[PDB]
Amino acid sequence: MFTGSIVAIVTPMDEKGNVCRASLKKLIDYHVASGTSAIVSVGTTGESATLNHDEHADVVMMTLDLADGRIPVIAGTGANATAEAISLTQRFNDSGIVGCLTVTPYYNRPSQEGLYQHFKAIAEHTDLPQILYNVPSRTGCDLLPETVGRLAKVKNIIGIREATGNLTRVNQIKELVSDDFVLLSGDDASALDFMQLGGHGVISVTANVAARDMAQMCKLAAEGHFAEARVINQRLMPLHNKLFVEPNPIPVKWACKELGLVATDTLRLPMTPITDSGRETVRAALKHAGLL
Amino acid sequence: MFTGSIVAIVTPMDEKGNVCRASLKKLIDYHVASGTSAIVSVGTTGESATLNHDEHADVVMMTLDLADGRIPVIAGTGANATAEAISLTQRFNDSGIVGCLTVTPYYNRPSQEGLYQHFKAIAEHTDLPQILYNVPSRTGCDLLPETVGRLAKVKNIIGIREATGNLTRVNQIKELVSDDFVLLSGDDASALDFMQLGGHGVISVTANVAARDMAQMCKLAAEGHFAEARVINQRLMPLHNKLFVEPNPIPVKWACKELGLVATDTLRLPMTPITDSGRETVRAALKHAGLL
Ligand SMILES: [Cl-]
Ligand SMILES: [Cl-]
Ligand SMILES: [K+]
Ligand SMILES: [K+]
Ligand SMILES: [K+]
Ligand SMILES: [K+]
């Protein structure tokens, strides 16, 4: 399922930075019970950066196992080397995931033609649906609408997580692609505007801690009840902003720990523990949201 | 050696995308003859993004063997996971490289504290000199002078490649570090200006194809003959710019092949072959530099 509220799930860790199965189970039961549409496993928020490919694969498999068919799982499969992205996709074929979330190469700043060839080749070597992921503030390159339009002609490239926060992109992309191509926000604070403009959902960081409210907001938006959805969005807005007061996923792991959804808020370097002031900011946002 | 003209050397490949030994030797001989001060092996220009760690180590080791003690070799060791950066660094411990060039974590956007802890930990697991590398347009994060000052207190953190193109950084960092802390430009187009402000040299892309001029310019600059160095710079300025007409290292690899320095201009996806319009642009810049 590639519409509605999709959670970019944290990878919960013990004190030693190892994946905590018990916290993961809890998170997954929480999203099943709250009506989250799907789980994105080991994306940015899941600390893809600091897991090796074995741990990455382990987390995804464990996620599917715990999900036990109750919720669709999408694996983060992005890499800045095309051969690496291809190889990582192969690890997940026939695993039971329903699709892949695949980021524009970061750091090496390819041209639009190179992004085209990158994603074309990945899609070529799998039957799994591919969701493109554009986030220029992290990657240093910007996948423009024109190129999204080219890639949408490839059979199994089915959508895009658009994280520019630039809402003019929704209709620039939409007019170049077919009506079954999915447009998903990757910027929590502007996601409802994104959906009001034509977007079909959100791959969300906020959904980690406000799953029910996010699920309902996305359904209201899809039904066109934007004023109703906006009341919810207004109570989540401090969370939408303050979950990035410090680098994601530092605030969201702390929030998960504070709600008792995970055992520890541990991350791997270069991520560092939340500051006292950040705890204060985030706790205030959780309260504004009515979660505490 | 950590002053003067230091080349961020390309990793020449055969048509299969694997390291081309004959081309590498030719490049290293070229830099020996030209008075280049040192080689950075497998940094960004050397396609650190698309080589796996074993291939990366292979290239560094081959470069060192080929250098045969004639010219100092610095290993690119950057990674966005701290554990990974330590592991890559350890491959080169007791190897014959004289130092490491280590970039701020890309993509995951750590805090200043995160950056401090990342580089502190790397430095603690090695005796090799460390050169920090700041390039926010590639990484999505910016290592501020205050944090450079803090890291410069670590025994084996000895300099910075500053690639913001923001010249105000030279004296901001200089006033916070000791006088043997090395300041190196990472932006060819502004590198002479950088040196005029008190910079000690450049880790250069242009030096791949204009090594003699680059060496002479940094020499004149170190002697305080800025008027005279500037004549060289003006001759090289179209290269400083047009070597980024297409994503680095697409133009400089083509330039190398055109100058007969490497056998092929092959790169690994997502880097793509230079366009016809790019060939003409780089050719005019080479001609302006008097190299064609
Ligand atoms: Cl994410
Ligand atoms: Cl470089
Ligand atoms: K296919
Ligand atoms: K399609
Ligand atoms: K790599
Ligand atoms: K030092």
Swiss-Prot record, chains A, B:
Broadest EC class?
Answer: lyase
Which named protein is this?
4-hydroxy-tetrahydrodipicolinate synthase
Record lineage? Bacteria, Pseudomonadati, Pseudomonadota, Gammaproteobacteria, Enterobacterales
Where in the chain is the site L-lysine inhibitor binding?
A49, N80, E84, Y106
Q: Which SMART domains match?
A: DHDPS
**Per the record, what is the consequence of mutating Y107W?**
Reduced activity by 95%. Reduced affinity for both substrates. Exists as a mixture of monomer, dimer and tetramer in solution. Has significantly lower thermal stability than the wild-type enzyme
What, per the annotation, is the impact of changing L197 to Y/D? 1.4 to 2.5% of wild-type activity. Decrease in affinity for pyruvate, but nearly no change in that for (S)-ASA. Exists as a dimer in solution
The UniProt entry's GO CC annotations, sorted and at most eight, read: cytosol
Location in the cell reads: Cytoplasm
Q: How does this chain assemble?
A: Homotetramer; dimer of dimers.
> Could you tell me the keywords of this UniProt record?
Allosteric enzyme, Amino-acid biosynthesis, Cytoplasm, Diaminopimelate biosynthesis, Lyase, Lysine biosynthesis, Schiff base
Per the Swiss-Prot or TrEMBL record, the active site comprises Y133 (proton donor/acceptor), R161 (schiff-base intermediate with substrate)
Site-annotated residues for Part of a proton relay during catalysis? T44, Y107
Which residues does the record give as pyruvate binding sites? Answer: T45, I203
Q: Could you tell me the EC number(s) of this protein?
A: 4.3.3.7
Enumerate the catalysed reactions.
L-aspartate 4-semialdehyde + pyruvate = (2S,4S)-4-hydroxy-2,3,4,5-tetrahydrodipicolinate + H2O + H(+)
* Segments crossing the lipid bilayer: none
The annotated pathway is:
Amino-acid biosynthesis; L-lysine biosynthesis via DAP pathway; (S)-tetrahydrodipicolinate from L-aspartate: step 3/4
* GO terms of molecular function: 4-hydroxy-tetrahydrodipicolinate synthase activity; identical protein binding
Give GO terms for biological process.
diaminopimelate biosynthetic process; lysine biosynthetic process via diaminopimelate
The record's listing under SUPFAM superfamilies reads: Aldolase
* Function of the protein: Catalyzes the condensation of (S)-aspartate-beta-semialdehyde [(S)-ASA] and pyruvate to 4-hydroxy-tetrahydrodipicolinate (HTPA).
Tell me if Cell division is a UniProt keyword of this record: no
Q: How is its activity regulated?
A: Is allosterically regulated by the feedback inhibitor (S)-lysine. Is inhibited by pyruvate analogs such as 3-fluoropyruvate, 2-ketobutyrate, glyoxylate, and beta-hydroxypyruvate. Is not inhibited by its substrate, (S)-ASA.
Pfam families annotated for this entry? DHDPS (PF00701)
